[PDB]
Design a protein around this ligand. Structure first.
Ligand SMILES: CN[C@@H]1CCc2c(ccc(O)c2O)[C@H]1O
Lengths: 235, 52, 331, 282
């Protein structure tokens, strides 16, 4: 009779309180997706910050949760539409894989993957944090004359280093030109399609780098700041 | 690879099919006969509706 | 070589299907009276999910339904009284399907994690964890308290024995990932729609695809049998919903409107089978008339994209769970 | 009198616009579940304050201006004055609270979700309304604001004239609490927000080498300032120096402050979601 209804109402109240606690826990945590090529170097950068791989790392008392959907050799990505509430999508690319062509170049396929992610009807508000791995190995390749980008990438022949580009404290002009050419190759795809809702943050990273956690924290802070500014029409 | 596909198509080949007119008539008859017991199709009375 | 033989058999199948056709369903149907305008309102609006919803499954009774979201909680609701009977935390953060057992004792959920976890409502704990799928399990349905059929990210569909925890049989033959699945009123036959245009009927006992339907031009997100079981309807990223007949072995109708270009996420039939209800990417549902193919109503209550759509076994109400974390009961 | 009927017509249009706009704002917020948001609760509080202003004090004030007399009772004069003070203080403090919410959303994006919740937003709104109601009703209902010179005494004793006379103390306190502290808070908030927006634009220009904030902040700050600041300046002056300011100018600036309420929801509801909700409503 009414006793069953009262007990059910009490159970509903308990479940609602538990859901409120779960919402309090959930709102604080920021979710990230680490999508990248298999040979790009995802494992090294994941170990740096630290079917699905989930890791929880906290910086400045902020909880970040990262998912990496690797394996199965998926070519038509349908799980990518599920990641709609993620603050940022971490994209890991090996900028030193320009010459290595897997039957098209690996970097060219990475550009296609970045274009597919960018031009997705569902990820129309999700920013992408771009990590270019293996800068040291890229330097080793470009210093050697065996493989040059101009042979593999035709746009590099007429390309020149940006005037406003900021070189590293110790770097050669040739490696600087190569890395900035790759970064601008990604940014040309990044800028055109977007309407200002989401942005791309290109970071040059080596395997020895351990400051990637701070870079991700700063990128997430900038992403949320820009989203809030655009929501209020200030930006 | 191709042998499995060939065998599957060969198995799918020998299937008896009834004329589309008969199947359409059967669907028509089912929809007409079971139309009375459909709260969605016919607006259920407010007293009969468990929700409202 | 073998490709020539495969093409020859495919051409023979197409010729047989064409010769089987006599007239379209419109030709017979156009004489009867139309269904008329159908108006539905949100009798109950159920609230309590943190994140966006993908799948629900009505219980055997019309009273209870179960829904899941990426917030990690599988919530069982009482539709009549708007009360939360149970809330089950989920080990996998991402879940993409739900299942409510015919007896009601068990509830199963899948996810992006390649594990089909089955929860015992009446003891909530993980009764069995089912593994052996390469890809994410898109849909899960219950043949009985002991048998469950799951469609996964890899092309294979599998039948499991819950007590043993192993795949009794596996169904192979699809090219893309299998997204949708539906069981017949009798547990003998079931279909599975996949990323490829083809949608195949399966036989549970034999384990072979008896028939394959490839009318669509894109991936099939939703599939659902006619209450008779002689027919089923398929959704797609294309704006077309198509009704396929097993005996005729070919498409009977396509449900599309020029204005709408969004895909169809979920489809379902009424109890009588007259009304086909299909969700859409356009934040609203459309209630087609199966025989007429003329849209009879619209459900625009939801704020975000709909992902699931179920009709009670009694036929009393239709519930749509959308991406705004809000699940609404229509009647 | 052609002059009188014109004033009646313009005040009728003003009150109709205020009521229509604010009622539309509350209806749009309450009807759709998508609009209900932590900031939208403060928007609803502002809209309710301005709606109460437009329903209560604008029509009675217009009647007082046109008829040149107060037909209703003295207690209703005091009640009208209290309601007007309450509405003005609540509206301005709600604008200040909205600015503070934007500041906490921009400056501290990570902790903004935990900083503001539905319960905390309700507590903040209730506290704002409580302090506004105290500042309005208590000094007026307990007759602390009544002046001491015979000019105010005759008006208070008389049952026909409803005019505002206040002390040099209550005027200063009410003006401060209603406007000046919110003015300082909003100025600091929007300066910080402008600095953050400029920094973000500079970083975006530093990357992606291949304005908007100024216009929005100019609207939000300049409209409120040009609507309320002159009235509060003359409010301070009329107790600082009685001879200079005239009653007619005082009432004119008060009515500019009133029409600020009708200007508010055109500024604070320009988001596309609010536009879609308005289109659905109409
Ligand atoms: C009818 N004139 C009133 C009386 C004084 C006053 C007003 C508005 C805001 C305040 O903080 C006040 O102290 C005016 O609207």
């Amino acid at each position: 009779q009414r006793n069953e209804e009262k007990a059910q109402r009490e159970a509903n109240k308990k479940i609602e309180k538990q859901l409120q606690k779960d919402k309090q826990v959930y709102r604080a945590t920021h979710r990230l997706l680490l999508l990248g090529a298999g040979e790009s170097g995802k494992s090294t950068i994941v170990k740096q910050m630290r079917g699905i791989f989930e890791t929880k790392f906290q910086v400045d008392k902020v909880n970040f949760h990262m998912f990496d959907v690797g394996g199965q050799r998926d070519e038509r990505r349908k799980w990518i539409q599920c990641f709609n509430d993620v603050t940022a999508i971490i994209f890991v690319v090996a900028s030193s894989s320009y010459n290595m062509v897997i039957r098209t170049n690996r970097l060219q396929e990475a550009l296609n993957l970045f274009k597919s992610i960018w031009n997705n009807r569902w990820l129309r508000t999700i920013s992408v944090i771009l990590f270019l791995n293996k800068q040291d190995l890229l330097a080793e390749k470009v210093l050697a004359g065996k493989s040059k980008i101009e042979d593999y990438f035709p746009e590099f022949a007429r390309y020149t280093t940006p005037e406003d580009a900021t070189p590293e404290p110790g770097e050669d002009p040739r490696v600087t030109r190569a890395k900035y050419f790759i970064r601008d190759e990604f940014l040309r795809i990044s800028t055109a399609s977007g309407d200002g809702r989401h942005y791309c943050y290109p970071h040059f990273t080596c395997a020895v780098d351990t400051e990637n956690i701070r870079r991700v924290f700063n990128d997430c802070r900038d992403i949320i700041q820009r989203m809030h500014l655009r929501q209020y029409e200030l930006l | 690879q191709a042998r499995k596909l060939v065998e599957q198509l060969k198995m799918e080949a020998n299937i008896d099919r009834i004329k589309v007119s008969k199947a359409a008539a059967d669907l028509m008859a089912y929809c007409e006969a079971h139309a009375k017991e459909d709260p969605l199709l016919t607006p259920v009375p407010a007293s009969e509706n468990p929700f409202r | 070589q073998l490709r020539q033989e495969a093409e020859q058999l495919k051409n023979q199948i197409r010729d047989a299907r064409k010769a089987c056709a006599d007239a379209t369903l419109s030709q017979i149907t156009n004489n009867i009276d139309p269904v008329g305008r159908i108006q539905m309102r949100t009798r109950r609006t159920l609230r309590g999910h943190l994140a966006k919803i993908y799948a629900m499954h009505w219980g055997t009774d019309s009273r209870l339904l179960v829904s899941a979201s990426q917030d990690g909680k599988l919530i069982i609701w009482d539709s009549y009284t708007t009360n939360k009977v149970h809330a089950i935390p989920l080990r996998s953060s991402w879940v993409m399907t739900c299942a409510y057992a015919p007896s009601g004792n068990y509830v199963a959920c899948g996810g992006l994690d390649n594990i089909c976890s089955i929860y015992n409502l009446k003891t909530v704990r993980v009764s069995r964890e089912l593994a052996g799928h390469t890809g994410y399990l898109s849909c899960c349905r219950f043949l009985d308290d002991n048998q469950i059929v799951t469609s996964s990210g890899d092309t294979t569909c599998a039948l499991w024995d819950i007590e043993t925890g192993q795949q009794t049989t596996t169904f192979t033959g699809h090219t893309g990932d299998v997204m949708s699945l539906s069981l017949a009123p009798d547990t003998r036959l079931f279909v599975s729609g996949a990323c490829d245009a083809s949608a195949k009927l399966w036989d549970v006992r034999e384990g072979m695809c008896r028939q394959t339907f490839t009318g669509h031009e894109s991936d099939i997100n939703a599939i659902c049998f006619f209450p008779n079981g002689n027919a089923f309807a398929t959704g797609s990223d294309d704006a077309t919903c198509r009704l396929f007949d097993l005996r005729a072995d070919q498409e009977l109708m396509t449900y599309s409107h020029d204005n709408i270009i969004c895909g169809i996420t979920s489809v379902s039939f009424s109890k009588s089978g007259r009304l086909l209800l299909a969700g859409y990417d356009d934040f609203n549902c459309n209630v087609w008339d199966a025989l007429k193919a003329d849209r009879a109503g619209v459900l625009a209550g939801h704020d975000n994209r709909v992902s699931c759509l179920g009709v009670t076994d009694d036929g009393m109400a239709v519930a749509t769970g959308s991406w705004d974390s809000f699940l609404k009961i229509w009647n | 009198e052609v002059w009188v009927v014109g004033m009646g017509i313009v005040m009728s249009l003003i009150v109709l616009a205020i009521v229509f706009g604010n009622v539309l704002v509350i209806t749009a917020i309450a009807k759709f579940e998508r609009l209900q948001t932590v900031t939208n609760y403060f928007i609803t509080s502002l809209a309710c304050a301005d709606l109460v202003m437009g329903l209560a004090v604008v029509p009675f004030g217009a009647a007082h201006i046109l008829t040149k007399t107060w037909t209703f009772g003295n207690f209703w004069c005091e009640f009208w004055t209290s309601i007007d003070v309450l509405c003005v203080t609540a509206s301005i403090e709600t604008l200040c609270v909205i600015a503070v919410d934007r500041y906490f959303a921009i400056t501290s994006p990570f902790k903004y979700q935990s900083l503001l919740t539905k319960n905390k937003a309700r507590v903040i709104i209730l506290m704002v309304w409580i302090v506004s109601g105290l500042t309005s009703f208590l000094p007026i209902q307990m007759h602390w604001y009544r002046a001491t010179h015979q000019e105010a005494i005759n008006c208070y004793a008389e049952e026909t004239c409803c005019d505002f006379f206040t002390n040099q103390a209550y005027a200063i306190a009410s003006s401060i609490v209603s406007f000046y502290v919110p003015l300082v808070i909003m100025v600091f908030v929007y300066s910080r927000v402008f600095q953050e927006a400029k920094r973000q634009l500079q970083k975006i220009d530093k990357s992606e080498g291949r304005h908007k904030a100024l216009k929005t902040l100019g609207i939000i700050m300049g409209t409120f300032t040009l609507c309320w600041l002159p009235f509060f300046i003359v409010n301070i002056v009329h107790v600082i120096q009685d001879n200079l300011i005239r009653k007619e100018v005082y009432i004119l600036l008060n009515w500019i402050g009133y029409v600020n309420s009708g200007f508010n929801p055109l500024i604070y509801c320009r988001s596309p979601d609010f536009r879609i909700a308005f289109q659905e409503l109409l």
